[PDB]
């Protein structure tokens, strides 16, 4: 053919990620309509520096939801600050569905595919993102004629060759006849890394603070009393346990929410607290005076 | 190690989609069966690879 | 004049999800196990002295 | 019966067994490694529960 037609590894920066999630979680229910601004290099690598939410609309997703006034307006002002970038695709929310492109989403996709044939359409579902990669995936049109003649896999070289898809349904139906799917990776620097982890000078502050001793003494008694009560359960358990079948032991004398195990965790927890409580106290006594 | 892999395993399957339950009304000769899902319509749906 | 105020991070819901995901480090401070807080105690002392 | 060979032992100490004394330091190095591994998986338990 005339392209390599190999599905791009999508590196959306950590700055971009934060934007993309925010705009889709806001607009629920609703489909939010944006564009991806980065720079395409190679034949397999897209780097997404920033994204733009173009203004929300009541027509959903269509070609009649692109607004070229609003598109240009964004572009013109990036140039003027010198932060200029070009489209590499577009993104959108499903407010309560999985990740696939509809037929109607394939035509939105198509407008950008004229611009460059490595246009990605990214689907965000933010009611099911409790993790940053989950239920987000990137798709890219394949040539229609590659399908007829069965050259459809050829994304299996220039890549990891692993491909995690999600779901039966619409996904496999559009995968077959329209697009090729590949995982979104997420890329970051070490200046950004320090920014997230750090929590100002009030981070060290928490570690010399002492607390009301009513709550400390109370914490101790609660744990203490708790281990008497499940330790009568423990007595029953190790009185018996002279009978064969492991499963049978777990029904009869317990081994499902095992008393020895539950006691040991709670005992350790309060023991660790009180090692801290005396350390942090003795530190302050000497240190400050 | 076994304890961490299993918790991740519990978590994994919760992220996977739900499951249901019907009762077979009749048998089809297309390598399918006709199931009637208990709050839902009939479906003729392919069968598991182990039966 | 410019008067300093609290400059806190507390984060949005939206933000939290990308932040943890990108994270794959054991964090500067998290205050989880005893190991993290034994480190922390000694870090605090160096902290007090520097101000 | 009676007697053995005392040269058979003396020979093995310098030759074969010297190599094996060194090999026992490489299994000792293993011990230090899995001392950290065992703590690392305690940290990973915290993260899987959270």
Swiss-Prot record, chain A:
GO molecular function: cysteine-type deubiquitinase activity; metal ion binding; metal-dependent deubiquitinase activity; metallopeptidase activity; proteasome binding
Gene3D superfamilies in the record: Cytidine Deaminase, domain 2 (3.40.140.10)
Record carries keyword Ribosomal protein: no
Enzyme class of the recorded protein, top EC level: hydrolase
Keyword entries, A-Z: Acetylation, Hydrolase, Metal-binding, Metalloprotease, Protease, Proteasome, Thiol protease, Ubl conjugation pathway, Zinc
Annotated Gene Ontology cellular component terms: cytosol; mitochondrion; nucleus; proteasome complex; proteasome regulatory particle, lid subcomplex; proteasome storage granule
Pfam families: JAB (PF01398), RPN11_C (PF23594)
Short sequence motif named JAMM motif, residue ranges: 92-105
The EC number(s) this enzyme carries: 3.4.19.12
The keyword Hydrolase is annotated on this UniProt entry: yes
GO biological process assignments: mitochondrial fission; peroxisome fission; proteasome assembly; proteasome storage granule assembly; proteasome-mediated ubiquitin-dependent protein catabolic process; protein deubiquitination
Swiss-Prot/TrEMBL catalytic activity: Thiol-dependent hydrolysis of ester, thioester, amide, peptide and isopeptide bonds formed by the C-terminal Gly of ubiquitin (a 76-residue protein attached to proteins as an intracellular targeting signal)
Positions of Zn(2+) binding: 92, 94, 105
PTM entry text: N-acetylated by NAT3.
Every MPN domain range: 10-145
Protein family according to the UniProt entry: Belongs to the peptidase M67A family.
Remaining remarks: Present with 16400 molecules/cell in log phase SD medium.
Domain notes for this protein: The JAMM motif is required for the deubiquitination and degradation of ubiquitinated substrates.
Protein name: Ubiquitin carboxyl-terminal hydrolase RPN11
Native species: Saccharomyces cerevisiae (strain ATCC 204508 / S288c) (Baker's yeast)
Swiss-Prot record, chain B:
Domain of life of the organism encoding this protein: Eukaryota
Compartments in which it is found: Cytoplasm; Nucleus
Post-translational modifications: N-acetylated by NAT1.
Family assignment from sequence similarity: Belongs to the AAA ATPase family.
Note: Present with 4700 molecules/cell in log phase SD medium.
Task of the protein: The 26S proteasome is involved in the ATP-dependent degradation of ubiquitinated proteins. The regulatory (or ATPase) complex confers ATP dependency and substrate specificity to the 26S complex.
Assembly with partners or alone: May form a homodimer or a heterodimer with a related family member. Interacts with OLA1, TMA17, and UBR1.
Protein name in the entry: 26S proteasome regulatory subunit 8 homolog
Organism: Saccharomyces cerevisiae (strain ATCC 204508 / S288c) (Baker's yeast)
Gene: RPT6
Curated annotation (Swiss-Prot), chain C:
Post-translational modification: N-acetylated by NAT1.
Organism superkingdom: Eukaryota
Its biological purpose: Acts as a regulatory subunit of the 26S proteasome which is involved in the ATP-dependent degradation of ubiquitinated proteins.
Miscellaneous: Present with 19800 molecules/cell in log phase SD medium.
Similarity comment text for this entry: Belongs to the peptidase M67A family.
Name of protein: 26S proteasome regulatory subunit RPN8
Residues of the full protein shown: 153 to 203 of 338
UniProtKB/Swiss-Prot annotation, chain D:
Top-rank taxon: Eukaryota
Record note on modification: N-acetylated by NAT3.
Subcellular location as annotated: Cytoplasm; Nucleus
Similarity annotation: Belongs to the AAA ATPase family.
Function according to Swiss-Prot or TrEMBL: The 26S proteasome is involved in the ATP-dependent degradation of ubiquitinated proteins. The regulatory (or ATPase) complex confers ATP dependency and substrate specificity to the 26S complex.
Record's protein name: 26S proteasome regulatory subunit 6B homolog
Organism, scientific name: Saccharomyces cerevisiae (strain ATCC 204508 / S288c)
Residues of the full protein shown: 35 to 84 of 428
